[PDB]
Design an enzyme around this catalytic site. Structure first.
Site, PDB file in Angstrom:
ATOM      1  N   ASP A 234       9.917 -13.551   5.913  1.00  0.00           N
ATOM      2  CA  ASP A 234      11.032 -12.508   6.136  1.00  0.00           C
ATOM      3  C   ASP A 234      10.576 -11.058   5.672  1.00  0.00           C
ATOM      4  O   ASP A 234       9.813 -11.032   4.543  1.00  0.00           O
ATOM      5  CB  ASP A 234      12.095 -13.023   5.271  1.00  0.00           C
ATOM      6  CG  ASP A 234      13.530 -12.381   5.436  1.00  0.00           C
ATOM      7  OD1 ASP A 234      13.486 -11.473   6.426  1.00  0.00           O
ATOM      8  OD2 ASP A 234      14.551 -12.706   4.716  1.00  0.00           O
TER       9      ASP A 234
ATOM     10  N   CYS B  30      16.721 -14.891  13.907  1.00  0.00           N
ATOM     11  CA  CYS B  30      15.973 -15.265  12.390  1.00  0.00           C
ATOM     12  C   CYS B  30      17.002 -15.737  11.512  1.00  0.00           C
ATOM     13  O   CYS B  30      17.837 -16.547  11.856  1.00  0.00           O
ATOM     14  CB  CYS B  30      15.028 -13.968  12.299  1.00  0.00           C
ATOM     15  SG  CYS B  30      16.201 -12.475  12.473  1.00  0.00           S
ATOM     16  N   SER B  31      17.091 -14.805  10.518  1.00  0.00           N
ATOM     17  CA  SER B  31      18.209 -15.296   9.544  1.00  0.00           C
ATOM     18  C   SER B  31      19.231 -14.463   9.739  1.00  0.00           C
ATOM     19  O   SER B  31      20.374 -14.917  10.050  1.00  0.00           O
ATOM     20  CB  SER B  31      17.594 -15.188   8.057  1.00  0.00           C
ATOM     21  OG  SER B  31      18.499 -15.825   7.045  1.00  0.00           O
ATOM     22  N   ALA B  32      19.089 -13.032   9.759  1.00  0.00           N
ATOM     23  CA  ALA B  32      20.139 -12.132  10.040  1.00  0.00           C
ATOM     24  C   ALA B  32      20.362 -11.682  11.332  1.00  0.00           C
ATOM     25  O   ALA B  32      21.135 -11.112  11.657  1.00  0.00           O
ATOM     26  CB  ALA B  32      20.064 -11.122   9.000  1.00  0.00           C
ATOM     27  N   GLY B  33      19.208 -12.181  12.129  1.00  0.00           N
ATOM     28  CA  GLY B  33      19.111 -11.289  13.502  1.00  0.00           C
ATOM     29  C   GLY B  33      19.109 -10.167  13.405  1.00  0.00           C
ATOM     30  O   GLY B  33      19.596  -9.394  14.386  1.00  0.00           O
TER      31      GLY B  33
ATOM     32  N   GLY C 113      15.397  -8.314  11.784  1.00  0.00           N
ATOM     33  CA  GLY C 113      13.898  -7.612  11.614  1.00  0.00           C
ATOM     34  C   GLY C 113      13.147  -8.402  12.329  1.00  0.00           C
ATOM     35  O   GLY C 113      12.599  -7.871  13.343  1.00  0.00           O
ATOM     36  N   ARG C 114      13.230  -9.746  12.281  1.00  0.00           N
ATOM     37  CA  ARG C 114      12.129 -10.555  13.035  1.00  0.00           C
ATOM     38  C   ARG C 114      12.452 -10.724  14.551  1.00  0.00           C
ATOM     39  O   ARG C 114      11.528 -10.468  15.383  1.00  0.00           O
ATOM     40  CB  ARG C 114      11.866 -11.969  12.219  1.00  0.00           C
ATOM     41  CG  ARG C 114      11.383 -11.868  10.919  1.00  0.00           C
ATOM     42  CD  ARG C 114      10.955 -12.941   9.996  1.00  0.00           C
ATOM     43  NE  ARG C 114      12.462 -13.329   9.505  1.00  0.00           N
ATOM     44  CZ  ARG C 114      12.655 -14.417   8.878  1.00  0.00           C
ATOM     45  NH1 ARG C 114      11.558 -14.994   8.513  1.00  0.00           N
ATOM     46  NH2 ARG C 114      13.774 -14.723   8.331  1.00  0.00           N
TER      47      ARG C 114
ATOM     48  N   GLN D 235      13.370  -4.366  11.277  1.00  0.00           N
ATOM     49  CA  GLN D 235      13.899  -3.944   9.703  1.00  0.00           C
ATOM     50  C   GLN D 235      12.981  -3.114   8.909  1.00  0.00           C
ATOM     51  O   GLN D 235      13.611  -2.245   7.990  1.00  0.00           O
ATOM     52  CB  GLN D 235      14.187  -5.444   8.979  1.00  0.00           C
ATOM     53  CG  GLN D 235      14.783  -5.277   7.335  1.00  0.00           C
ATOM     54  CD  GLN D 235      14.528  -6.447   6.982  1.00  0.00           C
ATOM     55  OE1 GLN D 235      13.408  -7.227   6.680  1.00  0.00           O
ATOM     56  NE2 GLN D 235      15.665  -6.657   5.882  1.00  0.00           N
TER      57      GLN D 235
END
Ligand SMILES: CNC(=O)[C@H](Cc1ccc(NS(=O)(=O)O)cc1)NC(=O)[C@H](Cc1ccc(O)cc1)NC(=O)OC(C)(C)C
Length: 289
Positions: free
Chosen positions: A189, A223-226, A228-229, A267
């Site tokens: 992350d 990803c987690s937040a949709g 950065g990744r 991000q």
């Protein structure tokens, strides 16, 4: 300033220039992208009835591009459409599903004709829950809402795991469907994979599965937040396609265009650098062959 295309035969030098003086010009270019998209409202995502539907209450889909579920605020999911160069809805970007939104997530996959899902987070990262394990643990079928899902295979590879699922939901265009799930397990992350080769091969592999399908639908990426990744994966997918098609490449334009559709896709500056390193490496390899 929407776009900065670079001739591929000039990329190596372009990137050297950006990298000079401790990334002076790289950072300046990157900061020009900071505010792209940020004029846009997320009023629906902010409705009190939707609060528990957001993993991060500060990472919300724009009203203008949000994915809507069929009515049962029942329409709401934290997800955003990304149009393609040639047609609408090439990707759906979403947050890591929550225990309370996984049925909504699978509803969305069903309703949107999605055949491929790309996950570039782990479920727990440095002791923090990042994503629910929203798919079955084994091959026994289970209901998610009014969708039944069954895992047909799980293949753990060095740096990603590929699963195949059979799903059936409320019948419209189809009545049953095979979905592939691509879970890249080596992306920190806020960071980047340790090599360019790794993510380039992952993107190529996913695009290969997409391209070989009789009809793929939008590809879901999360990803987690949709942010950065997912942003970095999608940008690389676009830029790699550019390198396979054109004699110029436009990383700045790719990130710009993503940010129009969901908050600050890509991000970190490091992630922006990594996209450049990927392109640099592909081009070096190709020049010699
Ligand atoms: C508990 N809450 C959070 O962690 C949230 C949400 C979040 C955002 C992005 C990611 N990464 S991911 O999109 O790759 O999964 C995870 C979680 N994080 C943020 O909002 C982070 C906060 C942060 C962390 C580190 C740093 O150096 C500067 C700023 N801010 C942030 O991501 O800003 C954007 C939305 C404008 C890109």
């Amino acid at each position: 300033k929407t776009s900065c295309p670079i001739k591929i035969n000039q990329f190596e030098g372009h990137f050297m220039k950006l990298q000079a003086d401790s990334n002076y010009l790289l950072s300046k270019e990157y900061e020009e992208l900071k505010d792209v998209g940020r004029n846009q409202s997320c009023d629906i995502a902010l409705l009190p009835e939707n609060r528990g539907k957001n993993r991060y209450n500060n990472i919300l889909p724009y009203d203008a591009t949000r994915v809507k579920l069929s009515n049962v605020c029942s329409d709401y999911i934290n997800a955003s459409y990304i149009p393609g160069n040639n047609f609408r809805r090439e990707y759906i970007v979403t947050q890591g599903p929550l225990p309370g939104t996984k049925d909504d997530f699978w509803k969305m996959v069903w309703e949107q004709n999605v055949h491929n899902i790309v996950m570039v987070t782990q479920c727990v990262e440095k002791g923090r829950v990042k994503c629910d394990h929203y798919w079955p643990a084994d091959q026994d079928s289970l209901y998610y809402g009014d969708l039944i899902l069954q895992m047909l295979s799980e293949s753990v590879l060095p740096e990603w795991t590929i699963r195949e699922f059979k799903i059936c939901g409320e019948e419209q265009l189809d009545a049953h469907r095979l979905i592939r799930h691509f879970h890249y397990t080596v992306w920190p992350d806020h960071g980047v994979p340790e090599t360019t080769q790794s993510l380039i091969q992952f993107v190529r592999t996913v695009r290969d599965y997409i391209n070989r399908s009789p009809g793929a639908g939008p590809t879901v990426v999360h990803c987690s937040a949709g942010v950065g990744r997912t942003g970095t994966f999608i940008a690389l997918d676009r830029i790699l396609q550019q390198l396979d098609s054109k004699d110029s490449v436009d990383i700045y334009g790719a990130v710009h265009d993503l940010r129009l559709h969901r908050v600050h896709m890509v991000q970190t500056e490091c992630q922006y650098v990594y996209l450049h390193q990927c392109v640099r490496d592909v081009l070096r390899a190709r020049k010699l062959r």
